[PDB]
Amino acid sequence: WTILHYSPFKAVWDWLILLLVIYTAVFTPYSAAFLLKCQPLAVVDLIVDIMFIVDILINFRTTYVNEVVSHPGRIAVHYFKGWFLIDMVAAIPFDLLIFGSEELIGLLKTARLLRLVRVARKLDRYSEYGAAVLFLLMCTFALIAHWLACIWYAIGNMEQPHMDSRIGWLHNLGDQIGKPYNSSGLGGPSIKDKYVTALYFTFSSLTSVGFGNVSPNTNSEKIFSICVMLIGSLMYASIFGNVSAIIQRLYSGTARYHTQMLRVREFIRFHQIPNPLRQRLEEYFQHAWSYTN
Amino acid sequence: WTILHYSPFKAVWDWLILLLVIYTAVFTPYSAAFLLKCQPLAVVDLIVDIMFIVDILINFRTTYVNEVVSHPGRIAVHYFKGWFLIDMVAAIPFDLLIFGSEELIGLLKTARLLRLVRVARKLDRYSEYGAAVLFLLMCTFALIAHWLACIWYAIGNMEQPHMDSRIGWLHNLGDQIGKPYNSSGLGGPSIKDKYVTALYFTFSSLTSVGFGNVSPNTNSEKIFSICVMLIGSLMYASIFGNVSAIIQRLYSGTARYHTQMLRVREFIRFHQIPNPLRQRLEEYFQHAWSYTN
Amino acid sequence: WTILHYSPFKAVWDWLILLLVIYTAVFTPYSAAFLLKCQPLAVVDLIVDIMFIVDILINFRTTYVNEVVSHPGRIAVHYFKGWFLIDMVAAIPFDLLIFGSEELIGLLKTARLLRLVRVARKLDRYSEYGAAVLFLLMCTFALIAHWLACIWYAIGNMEQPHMDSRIGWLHNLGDQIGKPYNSSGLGGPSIKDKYVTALYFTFSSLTSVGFGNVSPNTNSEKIFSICVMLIGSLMYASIFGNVSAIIQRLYSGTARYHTQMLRVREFIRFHQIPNPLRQRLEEYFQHAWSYTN
Amino acid sequence: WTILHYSPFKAVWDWLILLLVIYTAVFTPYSAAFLLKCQPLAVVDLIVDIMFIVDILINFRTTYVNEVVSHPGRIAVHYFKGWFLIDMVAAIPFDLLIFGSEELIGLLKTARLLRLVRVARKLDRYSEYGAAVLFLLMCTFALIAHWLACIWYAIGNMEQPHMDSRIGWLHNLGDQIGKPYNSSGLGGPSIKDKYVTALYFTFSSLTSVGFGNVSPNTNSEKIFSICVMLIGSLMYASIFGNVSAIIQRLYSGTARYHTQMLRVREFIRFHQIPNPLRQRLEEYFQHAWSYTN
């Protein structure tokens, strides 16, 4: 058998895989930055890896447009000559394959971020609806702020064994919250204190609030903030440009309505129309508009 | 008898109830955050509650459009099947009904914020005029900045008995203004010092100035600032998008005028028109424009 | 005799009076804030007051449009029934009239700020040219930042005799630049240090940089910053809205050119036009455009 | 012989000279600010000066439009009466000519910044392509942020021998990174620490983050920040205005597509079209669009 790409199943499956890609975009960068050295997130990662493998089987058994193509040989060769390479690299279980340092093995799971390409392929499904693209834009904003928080903690953490002698942002965090790093390397803030501070700093830099209790102090932290300021400015010209445009697109019925109403009102003023005829004109405009949009 | 919904009375009553909803939106969040443990604001709340009850009686005795409907039975059943439930929940005097802790009784008056729905219903009256919608947008800005100041003080205050050991924003405020909290819990800033600082911080976060004498230090304060940065960015794409668009709408006569004037001027340049004919052309344009707009 | 309102004299005089209004808008707020307790600015103020009196005589002897009116009686009665009241209040020499405290006498010269109305009247002359309105918008920005610097110093200075006990912004300035206020009230920063810091703070608040070495600390300073954040946000929706629109208006020839060029290029692509005919099409487009704009 | 100005050689040479102008715009301001008192950048400057001299020879031997002109006498006299003066001032090797203080000799090489005029002349080549003008706009942003970093270090450095007594930004930098200036003038930060901090401050001021670990403290630093706030605001109204407009221009196919699709969808809703005819309408729209754009 074979699946039609416009069926109610394949429509729901493509919206379900968007939510599993959003899960991968959150918990893969987090695990690679904060957790290096079954549990619920270890079995949920296994379930989600199994669903991204089931999606390869669905991609071998779904129709496509050349007019629709429905023969399994003409489907399978199209997927092989298309995206199958990226989909298999995003699905090889390197962590279960390898037996070689656990730092590299935990970092190598960042290959799962190729699952973001499954959202870039399918944008013709997701972008069609105004409330869906406005959701995607705010999740692109929150995911970029999260990925930058993982890089900012990777920088701030690597400068402790490559020791800066109390200069970088983690030593300042320890002193500010009353959880100082001891001279032996003991103590210091928790993973919640470090993550919530790293995410607070990257929203503060991207939205340009710059609150000044977290501030970049070593050269790698200053060079990172120059990059976040070049990202955040292009990203405000693009994301919040598009969000304000989509808000105006949803508002376009109201914008057209008031523009034609103001023309009718200014016409009624300019000709000084008597009340019985004025009411007939402005009531007819409201009927004609509320009928045809 | 019965009231016509377009009458000069019902027009003025709907603008008066907007001002009583703006009073509820200010003094209910303030009393629930800053004042928990007749006076003028106790009797003014009683007068305003009585007017929001009188408005339920007016809503039972006003006509509506199906063509207008004027029979009191067809009015009353329409209000019951419509908004009467929300209007009665917004008008039950819980504080006068109950006899059971005074913290809960003072918090339960936040049900009065359902009166904001009386403004959302009637937007077809209020949004029709450019100076009125520009006022509403600046009051939505100032009321969101005020509601966030009440949440920010609720957070900063709750972390003192759930004691942070001198980390949160109220201990920093006490040290900055020369009114420190003593080790016994005595002293500290006044309600004016705490409110004006909380409102200053939420305008500073929403407008993105981030002045850095008030800055979020505990995890609940940092998680609150991440929310205020996600609000403030969507809200600049929406409120100050609409305010700049309404300013351009009020300016649209001037924008059209200069666009048609520049076309006439560039035409007069391109054909190199002699002075007597040039004056006749550019004076006729000013007459035709100042006549028809 | 009588002056034609479109003459080369009256055109140059109205541009000269704009520069004397910009001088009044700078040096009147500055003198009222920073200098209270001949010199070049004392004689230049006398020369400029004499020119704003000569302008009243020109306003009695210039034609106006009802068709032009040229009889001196029909001119003089029109100026009396129009703006003469504001022009005389802006020209009464109160400082030379009075003989009663010198604080009030120096403050009373702020009546000269009614000369800003001479710019608001004549906007039909000034707003006609794109480079002139873009200059006016940047001078409205710099003059609002300057007037707010004069209010910010008036607040910060009045809280020293109404003594805050070392809390307000002037005590912090003295400590930061190494010019502390002594306990006797001696020492402290110069008028250059206080003015340049006050103007730096109001550009930092209006443009929303918020650098955090000057920050508002008393309640009057925090309430002032809430006002500067409500001004600066409406003012970015209006001034830098209009500056970006005027930049796009000056760019409109280039925007039209590339829009029609891209249509011609996409047409040439879609029909796959052969090179000799393609060159004839795209050269003809450049000739037709460079001829007619 | 003579070169056609539209030839594949002259097209590639004008794109190569853009990259050598971007090199001059980086390393000339840097050398004049940071390095005053063969190496790779000394021989690369010699190679690049030789290529800007070869470009004068190409400018004497290239055709131009009056219809094209191809006689070497009518070319050479046009270049002499045009830009040859600026091109020779940008190419006189003052550093190799002179033998008189090395401070002045190193500063005098800033005449090479006249090579930026070779980009301003040729904008009809570079501005034609959307990805090229979006690159130019981000390089104008990064080059203005770099030139301001060179001025900011020139100010901060000149106030050390014109000694401020520990007030300016370089003394604060030395104390913040754990590399203090000693009382003898010994020690202090490296050229990497000073450059990366100066560039971090000017991106922080232009993008308006204002992080508050670097902040202007002397009057020349405050007057510089008032200028960077007047630049950064005009520059956001212009550069990020144009970048957001070019992003919308690249998006214009998608914006047109969804606007016509939404009209077709709302028409199909309003007439309640049966499924077989609906599919024929919305498939025909996709064919017609994907054919003609």
DSSP B259-277: HHHHHHHHHHHHTT--HHH
Compute the nearest-CA separation of C3 from chain D (Å).
40
* PDB resolution in Å: 3.3
> Residue ranges of the alpha helices (H) in chain D?
8-34, 40-60, 72-81, 84-89, 94-97, 102-108, 117-121, 123-126, 130-158, 169-176, 191-206, 219-250, 252-270, 275-292
Terminal-residue alpha carbon distance, chain D: 44
Q: Which chains touch A (3 or more CB pairs under 8 A)?
A: B, C, D
- The rounded distance, in Å, linking the Cα atoms of D41 and A34 is 41
Which residues on D lie below 8 Å from A234 (Cβ)? 138, 243
The separation between CA D158 and the C-alpha centre of its own chain, rounded to angstroms, equals: 26
* DSSP type of residue A7: S
Least CB–CB distance from A210: residue in B210, B219, B234: B210
- The rounded distance, in Å, linking the Cα atoms of D58 and D69 is 15
- The rounded distance, in Å, linking the Cα atoms of C225 and B211 is 10
CA dihedral of residues A8, A13, A18, A20 (deg, nearest 10): 150
Burial of B73 (0-12, 13-18, 19+ CB in 10 A): exposed
Q: Which two tokens mark A173?
A: 């965090």
- The rounded distance, in Å, linking the Cα atoms of C261 and C193 is 55
Strand partners, C3: C62
Whether the CA torsion D87, D93, D98, D101 is positive or negative: it is positive
Q: Which residue of B has its CA nearest to D213?
A: B212
Q: Which residue of C has its CA nearest to D128?
A: C258
Which residue, A194, A182, A189, A114, is CA-closest to A154?
A: A194
Q: Which residue of C has its CA nearest to B172?
A: C217
3-state secondary structure of C17: helix
- The rounded distance, in Å, linking the Cα atoms of D231 and D210 is 15
Q: What are phi and psi of A57, to 5 degrees?
A: -65, -45
- The rounded distance, in Å, linking the Cα atoms of B208 and B230 is 11
- The rounded distance, in Å, linking the Cα atoms of C193 and D167 is 13
Least CB–CB distance from D237: residue in C176, C197, C244: C244
Q: Which is it for strands D68-69 and D64-65: parallel, antiparallel or unpaired?
A: antiparallel
Which residue, B286, B248, B262, B253, is CA-closest to A263?
A: B253
Q: Which two tokens mark C90?
A: 């802006």
Compute the nearest-CA separation of C67 from chain A (Å).
22
Q: What are phi and psi of A64, to 5 degrees?
A: -145, 165
How many Cα neighbours within 13 Å face the side chain of B133?
21
Strand partners, C256: none
Which residue, D22, D13, D96, D20, is CA-closest to D57?
A: D13
At B176, which helix (H) or strand (E)?
helix B169-176
Number of CB pairs, chain B paired with chain D, less than 8 A apart: 3
Give whole-number Cα distances, D147 to C200, D25, D143, in Å: 21, 8, 6
Q: Which two tokens mark B103?
A: 């913290």
Q: For the stretch A277-291, what's the b/e string if a residue is b when 16 or more beta carbons lie within 10 angstroms of its beta carbon?
A: eeeeeeeebeeeeee
> Residue ranges of the alpha helices (H) in B35-66?
40-60
Terminal-residue alpha carbon distance, chain C: 44
- The rounded distance, in Å, linking the Cα atoms of C115 and C132 is 19
One-letter amino acid at A81 equals: K
* Long-range Cβ pairs for the range C150-156 (8 Å, 24+): C150/C29, C150/C30, C150/C32, C150/C33, C150/C34, C150/C198, C151/C33, C151/C224, C152/C198, C152/C201, C152/C202, C152/C224, C153/C33, C153/C34, C153/C194, C153/C195, C153/C198, C154/C33, C155/C220, C155/C221, C155/C224, C156/C198, C156/C221
Q: Which two tokens mark D52?
A: 């800007």
Terminal-residue alpha carbon distance, chain A: 44
- The rounded distance, in Å, linking the Cα atoms of B143 and B220 is 22
Under an 8 A CB cutoff, do C219 and B138 touch? no
At C205, which helix (H) or strand (E)?
helix C191-206
Which residue, A210, A156, A157, A179, is CA-closest to B218?
A: A179
Which residue, A209, A253, A205, is CA-closest to A230?
A: A205
Under an 8 A CB cutoff, do B243 and C234 touch? yes
Detail the DSSP E strand segments found in chain C: 64-65, 68-69
How many Cα neighbours within 13 Å face the side chain of C86?
14
Q: Which residue of C has its CA nearest to B262?
A: C128
3-state secondary structure of C128: coil
Contact of C111 with C90, CB cutoff 8 Å: yes
Least CB–CB distance from A229: residue in D207, D243, D247: D207
Angle, helices D219-250 vs C130-158, to 10°: value is 140
Least CB–CB distance from C193: residue in D219, D226, D233: D219
Contact of A2 with A10, CB cutoff 8 Å: no
Terminal-residue alpha carbon distance, chain B: 44
Q: Which two tokens mark A83?
A: 């995206």
At C168, which helix (H) or strand (E)?
none
Which residues on C lie below 8 Å from D223 (Cβ)? 196
Helices (H) and strands (E) in chain A, counts: 14, 2
Compute the nearest-CA separation of C81 from chain A (Å).
28
One-letter amino acid at A117 equals: V
3-state SS track over C183-204: CCCCECCCHHHHHHHHHHHHHH
Compute the nearest-CA separation of D107 from chain A (Å).
28
Q: Which is it for strands C64-65 and C68-69: parallel, antiparallel or unpaired?
A: antiparallel
> Residue ranges of the alpha helices (H) in C8-39?
8-34
Residues 6 or more apart whose Cβ sits within 8 Å of residue C240: D233, D236, D237
One-letter amino acid at B215 equals: S
3-state secondary structure of D64: strand
Residues in chain A: 293
* DSSP type of residue A182: P
Q: Which two tokens mark D150?
A: 């060179």
Compute the nearest-CA separation of D209 from chain B (Å).
8
- The rounded distance, in Å, linking the Cα atoms of A157 and A147 is 15
Which residues on D lie below 8 Å from C203 (Cβ)? 225-226, 229-230
The separation between CA D182 and the C-alpha centre of its own chain, rounded to angstroms, equals: 38
- The rounded distance, in Å, linking the Cα atoms of B200 and B214 is 9
- How would DSSP label each residue in A65-125? E--EE--HHHHHHHHHHTTHHHHHHTT--HHHH----HHHHHHHGGGGGGGGHHHHHTHHH
Q: For the stretch B147-165, what's the b/e string if a residue is b when 16 or more beta carbons lie within 10 angstroms of its beta carbon?
A: bbbbbbbbbbbebeeeebe
